[PDB]
Design a protein around this nucleic acid. Structure first.
Lengths: 106, 79, 425, 93, 97, 22, 81, 97, 108, 93
DNA sequence: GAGAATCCCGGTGCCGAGGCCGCTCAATTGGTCGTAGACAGCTCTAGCACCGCTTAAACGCACGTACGCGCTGTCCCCCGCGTTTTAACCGCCAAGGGGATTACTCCCTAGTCTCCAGGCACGTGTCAGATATATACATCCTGTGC
DNA sequence: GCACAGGATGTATATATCTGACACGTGCCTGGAGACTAGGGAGTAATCCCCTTGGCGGTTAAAACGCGGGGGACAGCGCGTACGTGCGTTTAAGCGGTGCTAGAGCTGTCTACGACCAATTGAGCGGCCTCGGCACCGGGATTCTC
């Protein structure tokens, strides 16, 4: 049986444990640590692709393009805060206009 | 002329990405200088990674490696 | 045990009146046993054992510790000197916070110096004392001193003063000692200046002081005789006297008289020309022959560090046992005086003024030379009294050399002017 | 031959959204994302275990690391679900 | 015989660019620039096409951010026209010397 | 109690060493 | 609650500004700078305290805080010894 | 009496503060501030004194950097008087929120 | 057989064995060559030597003897190479750089 | 029992300016500085050598890392010092 | 009020995004052990609380004068529109040159015992600030007479 | 209203002391150097195949260039205001002192979690295949605009 199945996760606890083995961090690695890393990585992946799916539904698209990813990563201020120094290829820029840049009145 | 391969409508397009209404005519040569010194550091960092690997062609891997080193990392090109 | 009983009774009577005491007596009759008898009779009278202060220079600090160890061992003695961590250990060790009289607490005796009064005045601003003793109060007479400020600010409420010579006659230090005895009545120096001058000031100061002299007991002390030696200059000492004034303050005008090598040493440096180029040093050797022929204890006093560091070169030729004191460590002042009053094979001592001329028991010597002891007759009187104490077993001859026709003649006349004022008053 | 997270993230996507397609450049964007976050957690946990003179990586050190670099209202939910996962794995011994 | 108001077309192409996500600089001149700045360090450096696009996306991201903050700096000074002193102000304030 | 007694004894010994030898 | 954030007195902000070399200071800057102080303090001290109870100690030493400053790239020297 | 020009004594104390080394906020209010800001994450939290000194000298370093580039942002904005919008602009250009 | 360490065999003052020991259980890699500790020792020796030289002439300009941290701050932040190397650091008891803007001066 | 670099930086200070004292605060400044530089250069050389799937740390990758971090003029002085030191060490004859 | 410029909708592929089969290394299972972490105990350094006096400094309050800000005429230099030419894009060909792959050696660096000296930790000798003091000598302030 | 003499005063310049803050000489202990073993990682080298740079040529939107004009930067001037200046009145850090106490850190000791070795099986990656989502071209509704 898969150890991801006995934890009920869909990410490879064995493969990430193997990556941690040659990841050269300490001499000995606890058994529950790749399980916890698997859980947290699948959680963050879950909200990112869930907001990506929400942005895909908001613009009638059944495909994920990086414009949807940029619009989904920069509207949330929390994920904007964590991804502050990271750029996205073919991402784009959220259209934000300073209020005095608009012409005329009313 | 090969330094000035980028053109004035390209700086115009980047300014309209930035949301700029009016642009003075003396921005362009210093913007070219800023671009020329900005990509200089990442070329210098990429070619050192290239020569240390005993290879004489560059790839996307070591340049996004250098960008991750200098704090403006990029996704979607590996790394 | 002596006539000091009526003196301590008079001090206790003026204590019962409520004013602070003045002693104007020369050191040497043993005022230390008088002071410990005063404290013993106060502990017998109204039973105080606790807060007592002794302010004392570092030369006589271990000395006073020695007589209170030998004579009255009932009290618990606490020294207060040293580096900062031991000082904090001592400040912890009188934790106190229990005022008035205490019996089983070891803070009976506090001994300290003027400087550790001064530098720990923030540390000693608290802890209201009962009875302080300030011995050798020659160093308090200046009203501009920081020690004067922090000793006026003490609220011990009893300011008994012990001194050898309060008669420095500086026209203001009388007002300073009167102000330190009672601060409320004596503050305006101009009113004392405005208020035949010799006769009237006798009865102003009359009841506060006690009149004692050393010619009241049997004089086996050695009845010291001032034999003086006058000498000329050498030709090297002659030529410096015009090349000093050729370029034309008094400090370099003093050390030119002592030795010509005090500005330029002979280099390639014969000792025989070195000793004979100063006629002052020349006359030392002829005196040193007959005193060594008698085999006699020789005491030498000094004023400046330059002349302090030349006789040990001269003492190499005679190979004399000699120990210099000055800057020197206080624990070295313990055993070396103890070496002096025990060893008889020791003959020669180089001393400065403010360390060895204050309160050190030197009764085993009589021949004291003053090389340049002419700055102040009060310190010179103290320096003479450091050797001429009770216990000297023979006659005391005090040799005092001088160089004639020099600036010392004007300086001795200014000293003699200060001499004749203070002995009358 | 190389490894990736293609079918796994695709399974997560089809588990919560059975109608949305993924581009492989977008998939490479999120691959770089997930192994970037993995590298940050692993490096932070290595440094943290190095400070405490402990030669082993356990769940507590990575727990502190995901507590500390992850900001508010995303950290505590991740901590809750990861503790739930490790308890349901340890119970299923 | 018509002429549009200055500011009408510019705002609409700012909107048209900002809804878009495509490339601004032509690929081949930037290829020329990166080859001529590369060759002074070691000669005959072959270049993968993906690395060129990496340089491209990095420099549009950096210049778009720089112009956005420079426009904010200029609009702080009650001006709608940017200037090289605003560029130097942004470079002073980000701390990248 | 024992530490306070040891500290008091050490303080008395320090006062004896500095007071009788210095 | 208490005068803690305004316990930092209004000439002290002015003196810290005049270390940098300012000349004219408006009066309304003081509470905004107090907000700037406090908002720097909680997002440094949360990292400091997470390092603190990670070591099973409930006092904050001078070492975990300098690694907490090291976290965001604002490192400190001298106290790291 | 005789006064000086407003600003000449200001430059004297500017160079006095820039020649100084020591810290210019009292230790007790900062201690009470960090104790009342440390309680929400965890109660009964004791503190090393040199840790408090670390928080201290770190935050004067941050404040002198912030006041310095705020002064430069104000001197770009044709003023010597410093307002709230200078703080907002400088905190925008540093990037933190 | 009696031989000294590898520091003077490399002609270096910093301890090569100590930095080698830090390289073993510093878990940077499990395999460490021989030239890496002597090279790192030489590099750290050069950096320390130039930092001490700037601290020394900073102290001789202020004609002191003991290196106050003011000397270290004026040694580091007045050199642009060290400004690039030490951009984000804050120094204990270092103070601020003496500078003033020209518009702030009373130009009259 | 503690560890420091104090004797070595003391004696390299003393050999070039013998009339110079050092403050203990400045001494800790130097210790934290050399620790920071060593840790930065070691983690750079470590991850770049791991990046090229190389399991061994040698002098070539760490001098490459010196060419990465350090500014170029003191970098080339530093690598000149490193090459002369390693040629002196390798000639152990 | 018209009109260039927007969004939306109908037809055309088409080429690029999910399944299908093979199986190959890589995830998974079980026994050994020894060594690194967990937990109890002790101590002693050091951190918190509080007392009490201090005084540089902080707050209040009155003044005012240089500067921030509102307005107003001045260019003048950027912006929108024809026009061309020109250089980038696109499609494809090649070739050869440089990364990818695999095998085989060797040597160099990991692991272990010894030992002895390099580097501390903790003592003591050895120089800069601070306080005090006489004392003539030049300097300053003050009382006095023509 | 000004010149002359007497009293007070800095003061300098050393000593003398004299604390306060430093460079230098022993126990010790633990960690680096040396000798030995070994095994597997790196160096080297042949080969393969994939892609990367020129190289044509067409073609086609895009920049260079200039003109008209118009709206925004800009110099300056008032005014009023808002913070610099200074001084009285608390005041609350601060120092230092002490008392307590509590937990950081060291030692011991067990034990239990995982590294490691032998074996396995399975599922994830890659070539191959299929079909549909949507970019693009053409036509119509719609929207601020001057």
């Amino acid at each position: 049986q898969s150890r991801s199945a006995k934890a009920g996760l869909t990410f490879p606890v064995g493969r990430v444990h193997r990556l941690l083995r040659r990841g050269n961090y300490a001499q000995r690695i606890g058994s529950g640590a790749p399980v916890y890393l698997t859980a947290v990585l699948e959680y963050l992946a879950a909200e990112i692709l869930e907001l990506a799916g929400n942005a895909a539904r908001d613009n009638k698209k059944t495909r994920i393009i990086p414009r949807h990813l940029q619009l989904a990563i920069r509207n949330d201020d929390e994920l904007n805060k964590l991804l502050g120094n990271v750029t996205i290829a073919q991402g784009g820029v959220l259209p934000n206009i300073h209020q005095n840049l608009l012409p005329k009145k009313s | 002329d090969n330094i000035q391969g980028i053109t004035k409508p390209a700086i115009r397009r980047l300014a309209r990405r930035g949301g700029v209404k009016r642009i003075s005519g003396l921005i362009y040569e210093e913007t070219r200088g800023v671009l020329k010194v900005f990509l200089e550091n990442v070329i210098r960092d990429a070619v050192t990674y290239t020569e240390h690997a005993k290879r004489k062609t560059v790839t996307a891997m070591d340049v996004v490696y250098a960008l991750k080193r200098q704090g403006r990392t990029l996704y979607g090109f590996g790394g | 045990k002596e006539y000091q009983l009526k003196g301590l009774n008079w001090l206790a009577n003026l204590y019962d009146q409520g004013i602070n005491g003045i002693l104007a007596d020369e050191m040497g009759l043993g005022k230390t046993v008088q002071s410990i008898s005063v404290l013993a009779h106060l502990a017998e009278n109204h039973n105080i054992w606790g807060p007592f202060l002794v302010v004392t220079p570092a030369s006589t600090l271990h000395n006073w510790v020695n007589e209170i160890s030998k004579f009255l061992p009932q009290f618990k003695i606490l020294p207060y000197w040293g580096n900062a961590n031991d000082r904090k250990v001592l400040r912890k060790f009188w934790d106190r916070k229990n005022l008035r009289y205490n019996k089983n607490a070891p803070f009976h005796v506090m001994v300290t110096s003027y400087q550790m009064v001064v530098t720990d005045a923030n540390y000693l601003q608290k802890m209201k004392w009962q009875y302080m003793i300030l011995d050798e109060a020659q160093a308090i007479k200046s009203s501009q001193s920081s020690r004067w400020k922090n000793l006026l600010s003490f609220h011990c409420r009893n300011r008994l003063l012990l001194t050898g010579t309060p008669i420095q006659n500086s026209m203001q230090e009388l007002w300073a000692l009167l102000h330190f005895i009672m601060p409320s009545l004596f503050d305006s120096h101009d009113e004392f200046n405005e208020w035949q001058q010799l006769r009237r000031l006798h009865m102003i100061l009359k009841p506060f002081m006690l009149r004692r002299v050393k010619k009241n007991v049997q004089s086996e002390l050695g009845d010291k005789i001032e034999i003086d030696v006058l000498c000329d200059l050498t030709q090297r000492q002659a030529k410096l006297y015009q090349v000093l004034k050729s370029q034309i303050a008094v400090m370099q005008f003093r050390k030119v008289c002592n030795h010509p090598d005090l500005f330029e040493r002979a280099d390639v440096p014969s000792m025989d020309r070195f000793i004979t180029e100063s006629a002052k040093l020349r006359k030392l050797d002829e005196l040193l022959v007959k005193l060594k022929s008698e085999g006699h204890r020789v005491l030498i006093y000094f004023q400046m560090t330059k002349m302090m560091d030349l006789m040990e070169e001269y003492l190499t030729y005679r190979q004399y046992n000699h120990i210099r004191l000055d800057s020197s460590k206080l624990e070295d002042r313990r055993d070396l005086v103890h070496d002096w009053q025990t060893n008889p094979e020791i003959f020669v001592f180089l001393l400065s003024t403010r360390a060895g001329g204050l309160g050190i028991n030197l009764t085993a010597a009589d021949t004291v030379i003053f090389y340049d002891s002419d700055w102040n007759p009060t310190i010179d009187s103290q320096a003479m009294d450091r050797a001429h104490r009770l216990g000297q077993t023979r006659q005391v001859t005090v040799y005092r050399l001088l160089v004639r026709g020099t600036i010392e003649e004007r300086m001795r006349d200014r000293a003699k002017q200060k001499e004749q004022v203070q002995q009358v008053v | 031959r190389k490894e990736t997270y293609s079918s796994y993230i695709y399974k997560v996507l089809k588990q919560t959204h059975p109608d949305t397609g993924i581009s492989q450049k977008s998939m490479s964007i999120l691959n770089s994302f997930v192994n970037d976050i993995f590298e940050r957690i692993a490096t932070e946990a290595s440094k943290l275990a190095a400070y405490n003179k402990k030669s082993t990586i356990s769940a507590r050190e990575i727990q502190t690391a995901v507590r500390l670099i992850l900001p508010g209202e995303l950290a505590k939910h991740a901590v809750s679900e990861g503790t739930r996962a490790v308890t349901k794995y340890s119970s299923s011994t | 015989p018509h002429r549009y108001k200055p500011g009408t077309v510019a705002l609409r192409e700012i909107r048209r660019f900002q809804k878009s996500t495509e490339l601004l600089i032509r690929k081949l001149p930037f290829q020329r620039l990166v080859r001529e700045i590369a060759q002074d360090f070691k000669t005959d450096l072959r270049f993968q096409s993906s690395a060129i696009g990496a340089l491209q996306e990095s420099v549009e991201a950096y210049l778009v951010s720089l112009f956005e903050d420079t426009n904010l700096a200029a609009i702080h000074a009650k001006r709608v026209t940017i200037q090289k002193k605003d560029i130097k102000l942004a470079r002073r304030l980000r701390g990248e010397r | 109690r024992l530490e306070e007694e040891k500290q008091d004894t050490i303080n008395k010994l320090l006062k004896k060493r500095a007071g009788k030898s210095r």
